[PDB]
């Protein structure tokens with residue numbers, strides 16, 4: 219909507235207060251004009267029609283329970299936009315400042331979130347498995363990263379290419395979480411998963427096998443569930459990424475960590491310059507070796523650690 223740029227205040231799903239960029243024209247809208255062509259957050263109103271209504275508010279204060287998921291979808295989209303722009307000089311998902319749209323209150327008791335090819339969509343959870351899924355900066359960033367992958371590598375959502383697609387989303391979800399720096403970790407979805415159980419999460423990057431995901435190529439899933447296991451076999455790549463950043467010895471193979479920034483640079487470069495729609499894990503390893511060679515040189519520690527991390531997870 220055409221209007222003037224304002225600044226509202228609200229509370230997110232985890233009860234924290236934050237400022238949101240809004241747009242005023244009779245009502246105050248969840249339209250952030252300060253980032254690219256805009257960040258727009260919508261109310262799906264417990265239905266499944268998308269995007270639903272551009273979120274409107276009478277007074278620019280967003281402290282109602284109903285408001286909280288919209289607040290976090292809006293705010294965390296902004297944080298993720300800032301990560302891509304400040305850290306990787308990428309302007310929105312398409313690199314040309316595309317508008318970023320999100321819908322909250324999607325369906326009733328919907329325990330999930332997704333990128334639908336055009337926008338982010340967030341369930342409220344049923345209240346036991348999940349609370350509103352936009353509550354998780356790692357979740358928001360995971361979903362927006364699917365948009366980045368769409369416009370870049372274009373990794374097909376099935377089998378190895380699909381597990382790469384997933385891992386990139388978990389990788390950058392986590393690196394966004396670290397960038398925002400509120401109790402960040404190498405787990406996925408902890409802020410919104412199982413409110414009655416502490417310390418669990420949906421997936422683990424540091425130890426995928428904690429939730430039954432493989433941490434070695436030998437353990438890859440080859441059935442048909444989950445599009446050939448895209449959220450399962452992502453464990454192999456997430457563990458490689460974790461190793462590259464943090465270091466560690468995994469089935470006897472020792473990896474010297476090179477830190478998060480370098481992880482991010484290497485996988486961003488691979489994503490945007492070397493991966494293709496049909497890339498497999500072996501192709502990821504080479505892309506990641508080339509990206510590191512490009513950035514740090516053939517004989518660098520960074521290249522050596524990329525290779526160690528892929529050896530450790532059984533990917534040659």
Ligand SMILES: [Ca+2]
Nearest residue numbers: 275277279280
């Ligand atoms: Ca209000």
Ligand SMILES: [Ca+2]
Nearest residue numbers: 356405406407
């Ligand atoms: Ca996390």
Ligand SMILES: [Ca+2]
Nearest residue numbers: 411412413415
């Ligand atoms: Ca929990």
Ligand SMILES: [Cl-]
Nearest residue numbers: 230232233234
């Ligand atoms: Cl919050």
Ligand SMILES: [Cl-]
Nearest residue numbers: 331332333361
């Ligand atoms: Cl997903």
Ligand SMILES: [Cl-]
Nearest residue numbers: 297355398400
């Ligand atoms: Cl934050």
Ligand SMILES: [Cl-]
Nearest residue numbers: 427428429430
């Ligand atoms: Cl398990």
Ligand SMILES: [Cl-]
Nearest residue numbers: 442443444445
């Ligand atoms: Cl399934």
Ligand SMILES: [Cl-]
Nearest residue numbers: 463464477478
């Ligand atoms: Cl650390």
Ligand SMILES: [Cl-]
Nearest residue numbers: 477478479480
């Ligand atoms: Cl770092």
Ligand SMILES: [Cl-]
Nearest residue numbers: 503504507525
């Ligand atoms: Cl190699």
Ligand SMILES: [Zn+2]
Nearest residue numbers: 360364384387
């Ligand atoms: Zn995903």
